[PDB]
């Protein structure tokens, strides 16, 4: 439905939707922009990610509420409604994965863009894994493979303080702890990421230092919760 709107207008409307907290509209505008077929800039990649993170985040929060109610009850209404929300969540994840596969990842040559999209791929397979059962194994391996490829590129091409590299390592650690039942892998990754970033902070400007230390704080918070 966005095929008749100019790319630049879709991006401008995504920025307005963000200010208006209209995240479903924001995601639709950014999907339209991606479907124009041009690569996305750093700012545009962040708009895409913010839009879908907010949409799927609301769905995940709703699914967790309904799943909790359903687990305590063990009529069909709670199960039926949890299934409805689950199907909608899976549809949003499939949409994002489809944009990544057709054709954002294959056209991303720079490390910053390729790592960003591969991290997103890991994240949306992770959200699928949160609701999957038994099928679950295959989704988990898809998330792991995307995160691992992103990690390999990021370690070769980015400094340890780069915010994309840090956010990737953070989310992969969450994958290990919450999805893959590998809490020791999660703790090891978070600790090594934190320590390597700490030792690189001296190279950063005041602004970059703030960016990197904010994400490092999340690594430390998880380590506190996990140990």
């Amino acid at each position: 439905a966005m095929g008749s709107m100019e790319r630049a207008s879709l991006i401008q409307k995504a920025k307005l939707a963000e200010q208006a907290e209209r995240y479903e509209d924001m995601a639709a505008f950014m999907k339209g922009a991606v479907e124009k077929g041009e690569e996305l800039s750093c700012e545009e990649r962040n708009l895409l990610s913010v839009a879908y993170k907010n949409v799927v985040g609301g769905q995940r929060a709703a699914w967790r509420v309904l799943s909790s109610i359903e687990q305590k009850s063990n009529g069909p209404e709670v199960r039926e409604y949890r299934e409805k929300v689950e199907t909608e969540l899976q549809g949003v994840c499939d949409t994002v994965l489809g944009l990544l596969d057709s054709h954002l990842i294959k056209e991303a040559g720079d490390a910053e863009s390729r790592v960003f999209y591969l991290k997103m791929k890991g994240d949306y397979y992770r959200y699928l894994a949160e609701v999957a059962t038994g099928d679950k194994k295959r989704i988990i391996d898809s998330a792991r493979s995307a995160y691992q490829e992103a990690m390999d590129i990021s370690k070769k091409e980015m400094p340890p303080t780069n915010p994309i590299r840090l956010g990737l390592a953070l989310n992969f650690s969450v994958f290990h702890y919450e999805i893959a039942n590998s809490p020791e892998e999660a703790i090891s990754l978070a600790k090594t990421t934190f320590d390597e970033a700490m030792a690189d902070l001296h190279t950063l400007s005041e602004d970059s230092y703030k960016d990197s230390t904010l994400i490092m704080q999340l690594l430390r918070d998880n380590l506190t919760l996990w140990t």
């Binding site: 907010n54 919450e178 999340l218 998880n222 919760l225 996990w226």
Partner: peptide
């Protein structure tokens, strides 16, 4: 409590 993932 659940683990914290990357924030916007």
């Amino acid at each position: 409590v659940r683990s914290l993932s990357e924030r916007l």
